[PDB]
Amino acid sequence: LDRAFLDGVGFTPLAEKQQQLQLQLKTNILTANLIRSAINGMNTESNLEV
Amino acid sequence: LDRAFLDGVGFTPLAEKQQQLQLQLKTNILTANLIRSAINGMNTESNLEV
Amino acid sequence: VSPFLDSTPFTTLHNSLYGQQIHSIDDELAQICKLEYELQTQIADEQITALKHFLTIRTGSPQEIQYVDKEWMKSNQHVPSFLGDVKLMFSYRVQKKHKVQQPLKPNTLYVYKYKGLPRVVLRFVPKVDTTSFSCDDLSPTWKYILTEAKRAFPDRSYSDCIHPMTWEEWLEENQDHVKVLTQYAHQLDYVTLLQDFNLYVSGGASRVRNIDMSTLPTSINVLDHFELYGDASMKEYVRSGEWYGLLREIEQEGMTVNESEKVFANPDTYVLNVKKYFLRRFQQEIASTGMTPLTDELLNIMFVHWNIIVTAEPKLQVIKDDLLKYYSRYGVDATFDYNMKRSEMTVVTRGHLLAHKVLECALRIVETIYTYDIQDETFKDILIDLGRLIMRDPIYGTTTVRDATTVMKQLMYTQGTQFRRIMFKKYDYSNFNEKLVLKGEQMTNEPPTLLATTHYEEMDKKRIDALIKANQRAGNILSQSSIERCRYTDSLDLVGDANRYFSALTTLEAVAGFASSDLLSGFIDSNESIEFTGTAHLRKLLYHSVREQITTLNTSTVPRPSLPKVLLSSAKDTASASIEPLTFRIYKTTPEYDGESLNLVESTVEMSTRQKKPNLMKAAEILRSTVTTNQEMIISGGTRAVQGGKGARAVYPTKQPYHIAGSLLFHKVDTIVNANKKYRGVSNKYGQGISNAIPHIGVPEIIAVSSDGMAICLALDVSAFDVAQKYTEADIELAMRDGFLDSEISMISGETVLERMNPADLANNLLTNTPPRYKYQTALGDIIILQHDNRSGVPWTGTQNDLVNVSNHHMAYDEYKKRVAELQRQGKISIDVNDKHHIVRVFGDDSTFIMTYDEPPSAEEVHLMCATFVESYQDTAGTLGFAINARKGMIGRYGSEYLKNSAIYGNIKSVNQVKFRGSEKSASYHFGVSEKVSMIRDITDLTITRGCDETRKWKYNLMMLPVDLTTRAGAFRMHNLCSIMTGVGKMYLGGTLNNKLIASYHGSSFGWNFDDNLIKTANSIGAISDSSYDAISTKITNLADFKDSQQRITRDIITSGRLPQHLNRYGKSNILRHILASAAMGPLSQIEKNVNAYNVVMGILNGKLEAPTVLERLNMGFKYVVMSDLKQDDYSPYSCQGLQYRRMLVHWGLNDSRITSFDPKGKLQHLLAKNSQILPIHFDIEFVYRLYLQAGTMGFLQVMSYYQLPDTLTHEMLAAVVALELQLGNDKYAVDMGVYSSQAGQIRINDALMDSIIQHRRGPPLPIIDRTLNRLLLHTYMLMFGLMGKSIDSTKIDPTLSWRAILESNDQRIAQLSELLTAV
């Protein structure tokens, strides 16, 4: 029943989340930080199932 | 016997290790660090004999 | 003293540096350059004379030469200073027309002279058309040809000659093989006609043959003479007329008189004119594009340079004898009037229909014999006899001898005495990523235990029958000689120069070029040889296997691209089926300069399309309302042609919505299948993702399975696989449908509009069978059909083919195991012969089967088990349409055969068979000098790589460099000489290696500084065409597309580049504005080449060109280089190549991983592929290359650093792209797709060992802008000295130059950051 009547999901796109994170981190753009580089390997294509 | 029956070796490419190290070091890319520089001269052409 | 001699090979540089001592590397390179300069001089010395003779024959005999070096440029000239920089800005109305004094003399020769080297020939014909059967009305070349032929052989009816077939003999030979379709009376569906009659012919005359239009033209004929295909009873023509009479008398009273039944009984309908039928059949069947017109090749290779050819091989006199007698005996009918009406050459037949192909074959015979350096008797003989057999019938004879040639290629090595086995390391068949390394050789007398030892007589009789059938119609070529000599082919051995023979034999098989077969006849018989008779259990097994195999692949975490991205990916695909260009009107108001025959003229003529137009304007409708369901609609059908004359291949194009919807449904299946990098994954079975460009890396398993004795290979091949599925399509498509219902979280909701549908919804609508109908054009009418099956242009044909191929293989192996177990319990194969691992690899239709054993079964065991398997597959996996033949595939042991690449005893036997000189679907005769020089160098490189002597092939190629590369510039003719090949990066004295950079640095003193600038001015000025952007003016439409495509921005839309110089051209908002022009260069690039043809002449007319390049300004080099001798052993898996190349390969070993080796053509493409899901919408190799070309090294970084991409990888691929731009020039063919350096990619010089060669540096890590440059220079240096015979094992960076290089970024990063510091 849940599968048949949940045809979509209202997720915000990942690009806006990346941009919001970039503005909040105090580290320099050139300096490498793992938290920033880790979320870049994500996609929202399995959001409906979850 | 070991030389005759050990014809391969499962190393990871040096490029991946270099990228992992550059990502792990929380130091500016512009400045010079002698740890990143030192491993830049390594070669993996004598792994089998070792 | 003539260089054109076999005694003088361009290979006199290998034994040079082998033994003696070498010093600092500055003077041996100068010595090589000086020697090549001398060679080029003696080459041009006779090239000019050959050009003079050719022009004297082609035109009025008086011709005189005059050296026109820079000192002469002071002489009378013309200067339109205003119209100087010729360019295009923005049935014709003529502009201002001012006269010019015709600076050049009408009929003379002007050869250049730059630094003592004649390199450019210039002349012009001032449009001397006076007022604008009949043998006199022939071209002067044809008149000379006829006069010489008549002088040679007048009359006497010279025997063993050409006897063109006539109509009344063609009828006696093929009267039982022609039938009339008779639309309503064939009683077979999926064919419908609207011409009231049509001709079906199979076997008898399926390909047109050499017949004359005048013997028995038989203006009108009654078709009843032949037979009715569908019914024997309804054939009488009298009843076929009395029925008409009775029905007409009934109709007088008043009757329904069904038109189908009535008009059939009219004897009138069976009327046709043979001449029109034959002409139409010829004008869709044989294609003639090539690269040069044959009238130049005919006299140039047979009446001026003939002494060169005969002096080496005397057996070739027979071909000229045959050609001259053929011209003398009949005369006039021989015709080659070419019609360059718009841009396409179309031959026009008159005396004979296949007269052209006859000449094609006669020239390709001598071409093949000369280039392949056969060093054995009776083999070039048997080649000559096969050639004289294909002489008489150029197309039908090709198929007649195809059987004999392929069965000859089948065994070809069974009776041997030595083989020189090649030994490799053990290869793990399980891991697909496994690579092979060579280890040594061993000599062995054991013949390969292939098949056909059981069926030796069955094939010997078959080939002998084919040969006697060819001979009986031929001119009695002493069949005893043929039967005696054909048995010589299998008494060879894999030592010495015998490996070249297998490669050479296939080249002769494609002597005629690109013929096709009738489409209707093929579509008739291919749908008849299919049998269903079988059990429903097998159908259930197939259904369940397919459904299970789809389910395991669809479920994954791979992302699915959105519709706006997938639309622009479709345009990039440019499928020949998919393309449907449509433009309401693209007015070519381009002001084009005109020939200065008397006065300069400016004219504008409109032209439309000429390139794939995606109809992105109509995307508005495609994205929104568009239903993807099929209901008996009609679409147009296109056909392709193949070499070898095997048959006609049909492509079934699909509408845009279907292709778009399909790509989304299978994106997740296609990606995993084409993983490229996969390790022991379930995907392993599929090999769809391979380079395929080179054999060692692409198909490692086949070579190994061919040398190892503990495994066997099963390379069975099937009949027409796509047609064979027409009886199981309803089940496999159903399995495809319900395999996407599960493992998908979304549920069906029933929508019919694109973008308003779930991923699951697409499946219900798309995979619903019911295929469309296809309309193509044939002779005497156009026919439509309905094909149930995998189809062709379907967005999943390869996936479906590999899913079906891997399914029945399991069911065949299942029962083969039972049969083998049965044989084991009785006394035959014996116990202890049990396989452990079996691997099946599928690439579309073709598939292979490899089984490994612990104890290798003896020779007859292999035959028994292979026969058992082939019998098992033919009843278990062939009862539902498929058909396997043991005699069709290289089944057996010690040798495996993948797609056109096969390996025996560790020796690769590539098939080459590439013919640029006679290509099909091309306009090389109207191509630019740049495209010609790019194609002239790479196809020949492949030919030498796949087995050909480097010396003779390039000698023959050099015999036409002036005759080719003749650009037309409105009464301005050029004739380039051998020097031009230096600019693209080829050294004659060197090997087939891209020695471009090394030449260019030394291309300062020894000339060679001119040709590179010439090719640059021929190509690079098309950047003005790029700078000619077309604004939106006449139409707007829904224009919702710009809203449709968008990427997140950082510097708004009014920033990221204050000046439009690097802002407006790459605007996020202007995405589609940019790609509209960046998808249409060609339609006006073809005429931009035409206008650039003026500028290139004006460069040599004026003081332009001759300037030094910019590459040599920067100082790069090494110090303290250590150099030692090469290994000097010859065991290489590529036995067809030259001795020196084999010596290089063993020293360094086989190349691996095809990525570490730079090859900047594919490195950045691989980086781009691995970079998905962060890339913006519009991105590809073309965009990056054009952006770098337009914006230098500043604007590229400026624009992309504000487009939301991280800096490190953008910098890395920027280094890759500058390396690409410095490796060679532009070339539309080179940048698009791309072309490898072959020899340079099959030798391990990757960064793995290249890092070890460079001595470790103490200072800071060098930037990537120069590391990829200096290491590329080191790679080129490594490839050259080795050809000479020495190797470098140590190299210092010369850090006094490295500091200047580290200083660059110091002030460069500063420029990048400082412009940020100000908000300009």
| CA distances for C565 relative to C71, C570, C619, C672, C1207, angstroms | 59, 9, 13, 19, 24
Chain A residue with the nearest C-alpha to that of C1170: A41
From CA C903, how far away is CA C503, in angstroms rounded?
Answer: 12
CB contact under 8 A, A28 and B28: yes
Q: Cite the beta strand spans of C745-872 per DSSP E.
A: 773-778, 781-785, 835-843, 846-853
Residues 6 or more apart whose Cβ sits within 8 Å of residue C509: C398, C401, C402, C405, C644, C913
Q: How far apart are CA C908 and CA C702, in angstroms?
A: 10
In whole angstroms, give the CA distance from residue C390 to residue C385.
Answer: 9
H-helix or E-strand containing C943? helix C929-945
Structure tokens at C193: 């006609």
B41 touching C (Cβ < 8 Å):
yes
Search chain B and give the residue with CA nearest A31: B28
Beta sheet of C902-904, edge-to-edge order: C895-897, C902-904, C907-908
Contact residues on chain C for A40, CB-CB shorter than 8 A: 1174
**C1167 in contact with B, Cβ within 8 Å:** no
The answer to whether C1168 and C1175 have CB atoms below 8 angstroms apart is yes
CB under 8 Å to C481, separation ≥6 — which residues? Answer: C385
Question: Looking at CA atoms only, how far is residue B46 from chain C in angstroms?
Answer: 10
Closest C-chain CA to A47: C745
Whole-number Cα distances in Å, C199 to C166, C639, C1010, C1294:
20, 19, 60, 77
d(C-alpha C1028, C-alpha C1019), whole Å: 15
Q: What are phi and psi of C370, to 5 degrees?
A: -70, -45
CB pair distance less than 8 Å for C746 and A4: no
Mutate to test the interface with A, among B20, B29, B31, B36 (most CBs of A within 10 A): B29
* Contact criterion met (CB < 8 Å) for A30 and B26: no
C559 exposed, middle or buried (CB, 10 Å; 0-12, 13-18, 19+)? Answer: middle
Q: Experimentally, how was this structure solved?
A: cryo-EM
Q: Cα separation of C843 and C899, whole Å?
A: 9
- Tell me whether residues C1248 and B7 touch, CB distance under 8 A: no
Structure tokens at C973: 């003719």
Q: What's the CA gap between C1107 and C1016, in Å, rounded?
A: 12
Taking alpha carbons only, the member of C939, C964, C1298, C1285 closest to residue C1144 is C1285
Q: How far, in Å, CA of C1116 to CA of C1121, rounded?
A: 14
The Cα angle at residue C232 between residues C226 and C237, in degrees rounded to 5 = 55
Burial class (CB within 10 angstroms; exposed 0-12, middle 13-18, buried 19+) of C846: buried
- Provide the 3-class DSSP secondary structure of residue C649: strand
Instruction: Extract long-range pairs of C432-437: CB within 8 Å, 24+ residues apart.
Output: C432/C678, C432/C679, C432/C684, C432/C687, C433/C677, C433/C678, C433/C679, C434/C700, C434/C701, C435/C697, C435/C700, C435/C1150, C435/C1152, C435/C1153, C436/C696, C436/C700, C436/C703, C436/C704, C436/C1150, C437/C1149, C437/C1150
Structure tokens at C506: 């296939």
User: Residue C424's closest chain B neighbor by CA?
Assistant: B7
Which residues of chain B lie closer than 8 angstroms to A28, CB-CB?
28
- Does any CB of chain A come closer than 8 Å to the CB of residue C747? yes
Residue whose tokens read 């004379």: C49
Is A20 in CB contact (< 8 Å) with chain C? no
Q: Does B23 touch chain C (CB under 8 A)?
A: no
The DSSP element (H or E) to which C593 belongs, if any, is strand C592-593
Distance between CA atoms of C262 and C202, rounded to whole angstroms?
29
CA distance B30 to chain A (A): 8
Give the residue numbers in A contacting B (CB under 8 Å), as ranges.
28, 30-34, 37
Nearest by Cα to C524 from C811, C836, C785, C849: C785
Q: Are C1252 and B27 in contact (CB under 8 A)?
A: no
Return the HEC string of C691-758. CCCCHHHHCHHHHHHHHCCCEEEECCCECCHHHHHHHCHHHHHHHHHHHHHCCCCCCCCCCCCCCCCC
CA dist., res. C812 & res. C560, Å (int) = 36
Q: Which of C1045, C1037, C1085 is nearest to C1067 (CA)?
A: C1045
> Where does residue C1154 fall: left (phi above 0), alpha (psi -120 to 50 degrees), or beta otherwise?
left
- Nearest chain A Cα to B21, which residue? A32
* Chain B hits for A30, Cβ within 8 Å: 28-30
Chain A within 8 Å of C1051 (Cβ-Cβ)? no
Helix axes C859-876, C797-825, angle to 10 degrees: 120
Could you tell me the strand order of the sheet in which C227-228 lies? C199-201, C178-180, C227-228
CB C490, CB C413: distance < 8 Å: yes
Q: What φ, ψ does residue C1063 adopt, rounded to 5°?
A: -115, -55
As given in the structure block, the two tokens for residue C1221 are 């731009």
Q: Which amino acid is at C648?
A: A
What is the dihedral angle through the alpha carbons of C460, C464, C467, C469, rounded to the nearest 10 degrees? -130
Amino acid (one-letter) located at C644 = G
Q: Rounded distance, CA C267 to CA B15, Å?
A: 81
With vertex at residue C369, the alpha carbon angle to CA C366 and CA C370, rounded to the nearest 5 degrees, is 80
The residues, ordered by sequence, that sit 6+ positions from C772 with a Cβ below 8 Å of its Cβ are: C630, C632, C633, C634, C635, C654, C786
CB atoms within 10 A of CB C64: 9
Give the DSSP H or E segment for C73: helix C70-73
Separation between Cα atoms, residue C912 and residue C914, nearest integer Å: 6
Tokens 């090469």, residue located: C1126
Report the interhelical angle of C396-410 vs C499-509 (nearest 10°).
Answer: 160
Instruction: Give the Cα separation of C588 and C358 in Å (integer).
Output: 41
Mutate which of B19, B20, B22, B23 to test chain A, going by most A C-beta atoms within 10 A? Answer: B23
Helices (H), C1112-1263: 1139-1148, 1160-1170, 1181-1191, 1195-1200, 1207-1223, 1228-1231, 1247-1253
Q: How far apart are CA C733 and CA C736, in angstroms?
A: 5
Tokens of C211: 């017949």
Separation between Cα atoms, residue C110 and residue C76, nearest integer Å: 14
Query: Is the minimum CB–CB distance between C425 and chain B shorter than 8 Å?
Result: yes
Phi, psi of C149 (to 5 degrees): -65, -45
3-state secondary structure of C45: helix
Under 8 Å between Cβ of C732 and C805: no
Torsions phi, psi for C341 (to 5 deg): -65, -55
Using the Cβ of B17 and the Cβ atoms of chain C, whether some distance falls under 8 Å is answered with no
Cβ distance B37 to C426 less than 8 Å, yes or no, reads no
Taking contacts as CB-CB distances below 8 angstroms, the residues of chain C near B43 are: 1248-1249, 1251-1252
> C896 forms bridges with which residues in the sheet?
C903
What span, in angstroms and rounded, lies between the C-alpha atoms of A32 and B23?
Answer: 6
Per-residue CA distances from C1194 to C31, C1188, C1204 (Å): 40, 9, 17
**What SS3 state is found at C44?**
helix
Under DSSP, is residue C220 helix (H, G, I), strand (E, B) or coil?
coil
CB C511 within 8 A of CB C386: no
Cβ(C1027)–Cβ(C89) below 8 Å: no
Rounded Cα gap, residues C504 and C912, in angstroms: 9
**From B27, which residue of chain A is nearest by alpha-carbon distance?**
A31
Q: What token pair was written down for C1129?
A: 């052993």
With H, G, I as helix, E, B as strand and everything else as coil, classify residue C1317. helix
Q: DSSP readout, A1-50?
A: -HHHH-----PPPHHHHHHHHHHH--S-SSS--HHHHHHTT---TTTTT-
DSSP C1238: G
Å from B14 to nearest chain C CA? 9
The angle formed by the CA atoms of residues C255, C261 and C266, to the nearest 5 degrees, is 100
Paired with C892 in beta bridges are C450, C713
> Which amino acid belongs to residue C678?
K
Q: Find out whether C350 and C134 touch, Cβ atoms under 8 Å.
A: no
Residue among C292, C149, C138, C290 nearest C964 (CA)? C292
Contacts 24+ apart (CB under 8 A), C528-531: C529/C719, C529/C883, C530/C723, C530/C724, C530/C726, C530/C727, C530/C881, C531/C879, C531/C881
As a whole number of angstroms, the distance between CA C1196 and CA C1210 comes to 10
Q: How far apart are CA C820 and CA C828, in angstroms?
A: 10
Find the CB nearest B28 among A31, A34, A37: A31
Q: Residue holding tokens 């006076």?
A: C130
Resolution (A): 3.7
CA pair distance C1245, C1241, nearest whole angstrom: 8
Chain B residue numbers with beta carbons less than 8 Å from the beta carbon of A32 are 22-23, 25-26, 29
Is there a contact between C947 and C1137 (Cβ–Cβ < 8 Å)? yes
CA angle (C896, C901, C905) in 5-degree steps:
45
Handedness of CA C10, C14, C15, C16 (dihedral sign): positive
Can you tell me the distance from the alpha carbon of C982 to that of C999, in angstroms, rounded to the nearest whole number? 8
- C-beta atoms of A34 and B22 within 8 A: no
Residues C500, C374 contacting (CB under 8 angstroms): yes
Q: For strands C178-180 and C199-201, give the pairing.
A: antiparallel
With contact defined as 3+ CB pairs under 8 Å, the chains touching A are B, C
B30: chain A residues, CB-CB within 8 Å: 30
Contact criterion met (CB below 8 Å) for C395 and C677: no
Residues near C221 by Cβ (< 8 Å), separated by ≥ 6?
C271, C272, C273, C274
Closest by Cα among A29, B23, A44, B19 to C1204: A29
Q: What is the DSSP string of C279-346?
A: HHHHHHH-----SS-HHHHHHIIIIISHHHHHHH-GGGHHHHHHHHHHHHHT-S------EESSS-EE
Q: How many CB atoms lie within 10 A of CB C314?
A: 9
Determine the Cα–Cα distance for residues C348 and C138; give it in Å rounded to an integer.
14
Token pair, residue C856, equals 């290798």
CB contact under 8 A, C758 and A49: no
Strands (E), C318-447: 339-340, 345-346, 421-424, 438-442
CB atoms within 10 A of CB C209: 21
Structure tokens at C1227: 């070339």
- Residues of chain B neighbouring C1259 (CB-CB closer than 8 A): 37
The token pair at C1102 is 């004026």
Contact C1309 B45 (CB under 8 A): no
Distance CA C291, CA C485 (A): 36
Grouping H, G, I as helix, E, B as strand and the rest as coil, residue C528 is coil
Q: Which residues contact C156 (CB under 8 A, 6 or more apart)?
A: none
Residue type, B11: F
Please report, for residues C466, C905, C992, C999, the alpha-carbon distance to residue C37 in angstroms, rounded to integers and kept in the order given. Answer: 53, 43, 18, 12
Nearest-CB residue to B41 (from C1208, C1257, C1260): C1257
Question: How many whole angstroms separate alpha carbon B33 and alpha carbon B30?
Answer: 9
Whether the CA torsion C298, C299, C301, C302 is positive or negative: it is: positive
Cα dihedral C843, C848, C849, C850 in deg (nearest 10): -100
Q: C723-726 long-range CB contacts below 8 Å, 24 or more apart?
A: C723/C526, C723/C527, C723/C530, C723/C787, C723/C789, C724/C530, C724/C789, C724/C881, C724/C882, C724/C883, C725/C789, C725/C790, C725/C804, C725/C881, C726/C527, C726/C530, C726/C787, C726/C788, C726/C789, C726/C881
Yes or no, beta carbons of A43 and C557 under 8 Å apart = yes
Contact C403, C463 (CB under 8 A): yes
Q: What's CA C106's distance to the chain center, in Å?
A: 41
Please check whether residue C586 is in contact with residue C604, taking contact to mean a CB–CB distance below 8 angstroms. Answer: no
C-alpha R_g of chain C: 33
Secondary structure letter of residue C1116 according to DSSP: -
The dihedral through the CA atoms of A23, A25, A28, A32 has a sign that is negative
- Helix (H) / strand (E) element for C505: namely helix C499-509
Instruction: Please enumerate, as own/partner, the contacts of B15-20 that have beta carbons within 8 Å and a separation of 24 or more.
Output: none
Burial C455-467 (b: 16+ CB within 10 A, else e): eeeebbeebbebb
**C-beta separation of C1156 from C1248 below 8 A:** yes
Q: Where are the beta strands (DSSP E) in C88-207?
A: 109-111, 120-123, 178-180, 191-192, 199-201
Residue C435 CB-density burial (10 A; 0-12 exposed, 13-18 middle, 19+ buried) = middle
